[PDB]
Amino acid sequence: PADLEDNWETLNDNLKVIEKADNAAQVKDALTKMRAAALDAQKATPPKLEDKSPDSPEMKDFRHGFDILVGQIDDALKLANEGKVKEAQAAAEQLKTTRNAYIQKYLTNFSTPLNEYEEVSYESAGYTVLRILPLVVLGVTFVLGVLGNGLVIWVAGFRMTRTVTTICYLNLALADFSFTATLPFLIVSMAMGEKWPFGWFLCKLIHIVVDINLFGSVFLIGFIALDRCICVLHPVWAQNHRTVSLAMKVIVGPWILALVLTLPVFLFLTTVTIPNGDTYCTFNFASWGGTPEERLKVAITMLTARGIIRFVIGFLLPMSIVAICYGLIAAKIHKKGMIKSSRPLRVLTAVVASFFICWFPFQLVALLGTVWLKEMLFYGKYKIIDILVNPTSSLAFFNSCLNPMLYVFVGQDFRERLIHSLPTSLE
């Protein structure tokens, strides 16, 4: 067992002490601490992790790089024991160059998504059908989403009467429609092993439309829950204050919040080109500001902040609202008689179950991937997290075509209004 993080923390910390010089034994004290850290860093090599065997063309080369690292440490160490602090610091500059090679080697392999279509570890027929499965789910979500939410845009948007309810369903329909309309670009990207055959402009346009509407979808779901909660708990306040004019103002909130949380996509998402002929639409971590050492710490904190916001703001906030609001509604109906209970109980327990079943797996996988970010960076561990992204993503994406039946067409006025709008159709 060994921790590469504390090793490279010791290596970078002592490299700064060597630049301070100020003495001769101070360079020797730092280089000795660097040599101990480089030895442990050689012990933390993933030799057993990737084909455990002696004398290998790819396993004995990552261990040979530390020999050149330890070799350069001795070069600066022999010149330090001779009192010459100038030749010792000059040899430490080459020691920084190889350190920048390992940091870039960690960042490039990290920003490169693992192409599970060519890896031998996922060659079995089981993994082969589990890669087509999220593609099929996105396929049926594309057709059902653009039609299901398209009908709501037409019916509840132009055929029904402008109420607070129809405005809520229209915004929810415009969110899921704009999202599901980008599924063809994401299904061919997932089918090519996370590659991006589209331009740099589409890499930023599509993933912004995705993050804005998906954030909007869950935020509006919680907004509908809040509005439904106030009607049942405060019916007198609703008829005297719940107006269409007020709903026009307070509903821009969820969209502004979805727009701000998408700024990281607008600024740091771009098309990167791997050394061979492969293009990926990801965060270009190996092309940010500061020293290469600084690019390592800002990459973890950025993805940590992104994983926290995805879980807390993107799930804990709407899930708590949905659970509490419909829970307070279930208590208000349990109080008085069954006058308001015109909708079956399967309707009340579906908006809280469909939102949880669809989002919790993906939110759980993305959350585990955030707490194991460093384990994936220094060791490439927890590859099951990457494997489960697409399957759990498609499940959450499928919620964008279930909301029409859960919220809109579950009522009586919407379903019959759609029938009379289409001429000569089956009932």
């Binding site: 996370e194 992204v389 993503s393």
Partner: peptide, 6 residues
Amino acid sequence: WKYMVX
């Protein structure tokens, strides 16, 4: 690690 929506 892969790019995740959210």
